[PDB]
Amino acid sequence: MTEYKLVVVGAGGVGKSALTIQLIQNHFVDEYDPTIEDSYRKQVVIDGETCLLDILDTAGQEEYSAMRDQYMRTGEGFLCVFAINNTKSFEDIHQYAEQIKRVKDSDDVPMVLVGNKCDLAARTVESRQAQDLARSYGIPYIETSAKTRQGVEDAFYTLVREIRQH
Ligand SMILES: Nc1nc2c(ncn2[C@@H]2O[C@H](COP(=O)(O)OP(=O)(O)NP(=O)(O)O)[C@@H](O)[C@H]2O)c(=O)[nH]1
Ligand SMILES: [Ca+2]
Ligand SMILES: [Ca+2]
Ligand SMILES: [Mg+2]
Ligand SMILES: [Mg+2]
Prior knowledge:
Layout: E1 2-10, H1 16-25, E2 37-46, E3 49-58, H2 68-71, E4 77-83, H3 87-91, H4 93-104, E5 111-116, H5 127-137, E6 141-143, H6 152-163
């Protein structure tokens, strides 16, 4: 069957692990344990296609983000995550988008922009601000909550549908 290699990137603490774990394991991780590099694999049906999702959960902390560059190389699509209550994480999306272009050596890489923690009310990144960034990249913007599951499946499945357009 088809295997989709997804890579989740973004600043420390934005919810990359919580998103992946909600998708794969159907529970919310409340605690904050910084990731080095973890992998998840699950067979799913997406739009009638039996798929294997291979998901790489990467480090957002600079301290633990050593061999990030090497493990991202095989990625077929990237979830670029920021948190809607963390303006700096939004501003830093460009650093990831540019690192992605490097490891893939292409200007046309399947990507989805994700604004996570949308259950929170201390919002400092407005939807329209993120829509504009996504539009500049020619990619979708989707908001998610790893806590409530809002948008979680839609974000990962949208990334698969972006990979299929390339
Ligand atoms: N309210 C709320 N909290 C969230 C959400 N997603 C993650 N969190 C919280 O934010 C903290 C960090 O989440 P985590 O998934 O570990 O972040 P990360 O991006 O993987 N961090 P790292 O890059 O260091 O591995 C945790 O306390 C987690 O419960 C969300 O959608 N809503
Ligand atoms: Ca593949
Ligand atoms: Ca812990
Ligand atoms: Mg993590
Ligand atoms: Mg503002």
